Design a binder for this molecule. Sequence first.
Ligand SMILES: CC1=C(/C=C/C(C)=C/C=C/C(C)=C\C=C\C=C(C)\C=C\C=C(C)\C=C\C2=C(C)CCCC2(C)C)C(C)(C)CCC1
Ligand code: SF4
Ligand code: SF4
Lengths: 38, 153, 69, 80, 124
Amino acid sequence: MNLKKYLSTAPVVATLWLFLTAGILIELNRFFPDSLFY
Amino acid sequence: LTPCQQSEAFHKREINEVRTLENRQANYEANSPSYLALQSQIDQVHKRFDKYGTLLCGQDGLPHLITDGDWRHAREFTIPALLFLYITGWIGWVGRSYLKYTKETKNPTEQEIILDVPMALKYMLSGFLWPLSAWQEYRSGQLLAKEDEITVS
Amino acid sequence: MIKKGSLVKILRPESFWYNEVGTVVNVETSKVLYPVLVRFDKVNYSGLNSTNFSLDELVEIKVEIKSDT
Amino acid sequence: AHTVKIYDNCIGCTQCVRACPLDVLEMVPWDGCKAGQMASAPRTEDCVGCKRCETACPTDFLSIRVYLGGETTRSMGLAY
Amino acid sequence: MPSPSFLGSTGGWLRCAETEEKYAMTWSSDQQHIFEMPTGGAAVMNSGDNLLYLARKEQALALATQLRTQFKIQDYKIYRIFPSGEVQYLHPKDGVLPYQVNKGREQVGRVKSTIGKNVNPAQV
Ligand SMILES: CC1=C(/C=C/C(C)=C/C=C/C(C)=C\C=C\C=C(C)\C=C\C=C(C)\C=C\C2=C(C)CCCC2(C)C)C(C)(C)CCC1
Ligand code: SF4
Ligand code: SF4
């Protein structure tokens, strides 16, 4: 119960979302290169 | 300034960079598994040069580009690497703004900035089509503000 | 003369809080120059909540009575 | 030395002489306030101007002003 | 008058203290106690009034503020002038300054707006 309130704090939510944003980019530069088509 | 597939002064940099990497490459035995990955790394190096050659690039080997809006180079500025920043950043910004609209009500304002129910963060996905709807709501923001600002006296 | 608890707009000759919406804490008939204390949500740098204000200040904010459905 | 000027925002909660180090201000009976006190500074010759009353001053814009003026031995707080 | 004894020098035998005005405080001290000077270590407080020398005015008022918090005692501070003029500047009303008094007056008081207007219509 209260563990979700601690999970809903600003630092925990911030680190969780920043982990998502950073991991997506680590996987992006590891998988396909940007195709980019004129 | 000529493109690098015709610029003889760019391919020489590819040869020179691989030459500097080759001395580090040959000191170790290629048959070892911990250094078999260097050939895959130089494969990444090789697979990187061919795409940039298509973009106009400096004769010196320093590959330049275009931001004037020229349709032949919209890929380096205008369309992809630019518009997505605007959308993605503002998809976050207007989502934050919608959260700012729901930042009042009875439950304490400090509680609704920091200790927010996770459901609002899950609703963030609402903004698929920000543009004009966000323009309406920002009009209403300036409107309902009714020029209520600080003194500056 | 207006009843206590009205939504206020600050028009003090010195504090240009251009219509910062707030409510009247209480109304005093003691008749001084800066009597009215109001709940000022914009916590100033001093840190307090309610300060004294003039008789000018607020006139009205609802502006409507019967046409306000 | 320093020039002490009292605004008309006074509530008379005695915050001056409570905060004030060497008692520059002074509470005086007044007929235009809620509590009935007003701050007055007769010993302005001894004022140092440390500006600790503006902290305890309640009003939105402070009620006790002390504009920076000249500096003498009484206003420098030096022991020599 | 019997005064607390203090060691460490520093405060005494200063030429500036001799040529400049000095402050003299006192306190009832109904019981033997031990206190601290605002500029010194620790010293024992004797019975009866105790007269000391102070070189600053803030030093003369902080000690009174510190004494009032201990026990409930009326404080007296007298401020002397350079030659030999001895005037009662602390409690000239003999009523505590934060508390209300009957002897009321106004010194250097401008009753104007709050943004500014520094001109004074009347000094007295
Ligand atoms: C283009 C690109 C991209 C994208 C990216 C992004 C999207 C990013 C972002 C991000 C975000 C979204 C955010 C960020 C941020 C940061 C910050 C936010 C910070 C900071 C700081 C500062 C600088 C400060 C300031 C200030 C304030 C706060 C106020 C007062 C004043 C001062 C100054 C102090 C990708 C990779 C995809 C691809 C390629 C490239
Ligand atoms: S600081 Fe101002 S409001 Fe407070 S007691 Fe002194 S004069 Fe009155
Ligand atoms: S100017 Fe300084 S010493 Fe004088 S009353 Fe204000 S805070 Fe006290």
